Amino acid sequence: SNALLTSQIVDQYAEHIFYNSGAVGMALVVIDNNQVVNRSFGETQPGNNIRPRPDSLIRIASITKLMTSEIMVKLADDGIVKLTDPLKKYAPKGVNVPSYSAKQPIRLLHLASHTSGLPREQPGGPQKRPVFTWPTKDNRWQWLKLAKVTVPPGVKAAYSNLAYDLLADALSRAAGKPYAHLLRDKITAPLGMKNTTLTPTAEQCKRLMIGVGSSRCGNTVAAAGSGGIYSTPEDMQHWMQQFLASDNSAPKRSAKREQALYFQRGDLVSLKGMDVAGQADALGLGWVYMAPKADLPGIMQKTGGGGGFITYMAMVPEKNIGVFVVVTRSQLTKFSNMSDGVNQLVAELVK
């Protein structure tokens, strides 16, 4: 958008997204070239009348997967992994990683693009379960070693949390340090994202927004790859900015590799779980691409939902436009009533 109108265009949509989504609380972050527009609505806990702040703690849920893929891409540039490495290269000493057939192993690329053939969650967990706490890393590898993989890789997309946590495990093994140290060293420390963490302190937890379906604020390292990351609107602004040019900076060196697309929709036999914010026209490394259609532009996006939070990031990198939104749910909240509004906002911003 033209800087003269950016704020006014955001205002055409922001309050509608807040009301239509049934949010308890909402933070919206818009980057449009040199313009940054922030809006906050509602409450940080039902009935508390406290507006969300730049440093309100949030669960970003599956936006986490974009960071796992970011780390994979950075480690690949370092020569520490290859996207094509079999997962079994990074398996603990002597533990089997099953494969559809000998010459068709699950590779890191498959985990990142949801094409590994693995299930969405490890089966057989506790029926009532606090979010982002089960399975643990040890649980995953104990299950995997006896598991059967019955579909070849790169044939079907089936959205998976399990696969993304296995990816984080592999990346940690390859780098020779805990995943939390990779997240810090490769992402959060260089960008000064001082509230982006899998291990929040008490001081951070007191700032965690609350909606329907909330869970206690705790260690979420179990979902390090798939969904556990806590952050804040201001930290997420800084993260999102690295994909977008402005007068003061070019995108980060790895932005294009991070957003590379690997499977066109028609290149797969079927896709499950990929169409939450609209039809997925191509799958990247966590990122999902939707081609222009109706009155919407081509959009790179990722959806997230867990622990009473829903999140969405949509961007048009060529136009230096990105929108991130986080909402705490009320009972009636429907995800696409938030994401559809963001997509329409993005459509107005690109004009």
Collapsed DSSP state (helix, strand, coil) of residue 133: coil
Sign, Cα dihedral of 143, 145, 151, 155: positive
Listed in order, strand segments (DSSP E) in the chain are: 25-32, 35-42, 58-59, 156-158, 230-231, 261-264, 270-272, 282-284, 288-290, 299-306, 309-316, 321-328
Closest CA to 227 of 204, 194, 198, 255: 198
Angle (CA) 278-250-63 rounded to 5° is 35
Determine which helix (DSSP H) or strand (DSSP E) holds 206, and give its type and residue range. none
Q: What does the block give as tokens for 136? A: 């643990």
Tokens 């026209």 -> residue = 281
Could you tell me if 320 and 307 are in contact, meaning their C-beta atoms sit under 8 angstroms apart?
no
Closest CA to 27 of 7, 52, 44: 52
Helices and strands: H and E segment counts in the chain:
11, 12
Domain residue ranges of the chain, discontinuous segments joined by +: 1-351
Alpha-carbon torsion angle 206, 212, 213, 218, nearest 10 = 0
Query: Is the bond leading into 297 cis (omega within 30 degrees of zero)?
Result: no
Tokens 């900076």 -> residue = 249
Instruction: Give the separation between CA 267 and CA 160, rounded to whole angstroms.
Output: 19
Determine which helix (DSSP H) or strand (DSSP E) holds 165, and give its type and residue range. helix 161-175
Neighbours of 343 (CB within 10 A): 21
Collapsed DSSP state (helix, strand, coil) of residue 115: coil
Q: What does the block give as tokens for 308? A: 């009473």
Q: What are phi and psi of 102, to 5 degrees?
A: -55, -45
Closest CA to 55 of 40, 45, 73, 33: 40
Closest CA to 202 of 215, 218, 191: 218
Could you tell me if 29 and 323 are in contact, meaning their C-beta atoms sit under 8 angstroms apart?
yes
Instruction: Give the separation between CA 118 and CA 172, rounded to whole angstroms.
Output: 20
Collapsed DSSP state (helix, strand, coil) of residue 213: coil
The one-character DSSP state at 184 is I
Instruction: Give the separation between CA 103 and CA 76, rounded to whole angstroms.
Output: 22
Largest CA distance in the chain: 62
The angle that helices 336-349 and 6-20 make with each other, rounded to 10 degrees, is 170
Task: Concatenate the DSSP letters of all residues of 297-312 into one string.
Answer: --EEEEEEEETTEEEE
Instruction: Give the separation between CA 173 and CA 258, rounded to whole angstroms.
Output: 21
Closest CA to 109 of 72, 74, 75, 136: 72
Could you tell me if 318 and 251 are in contact, meaning their C-beta atoms sit under 8 angstroms apart?
no
Give the architecture-level CATH label for domain 1-351: 3-Layer(aba) Sandwich (3.40)
Q: What does the block give as tokens for 10? A: 């955001």
This structure was determined by X-ray
Which residues, listed in sequence order, are joined to residue 311 by a DSSP beta bridge?
304, 326
Instruction: Give the separation between CA 340 and CA 338, rounded to whole angstroms.
Output: 6
Burial of residue 245 (CB within 10 Å: 0-12, 13-18, 19+) is middle
Could you tell me if 96 and 60 are in contact, meaning their C-beta atoms sit under 8 angstroms apart?
no
Q: What are phi and psi of 24, to 5 degrees?
A: -75, -50
Instruction: Give the separation between CA 293 and CA 276, rounded to whole angstroms.
Output: 16
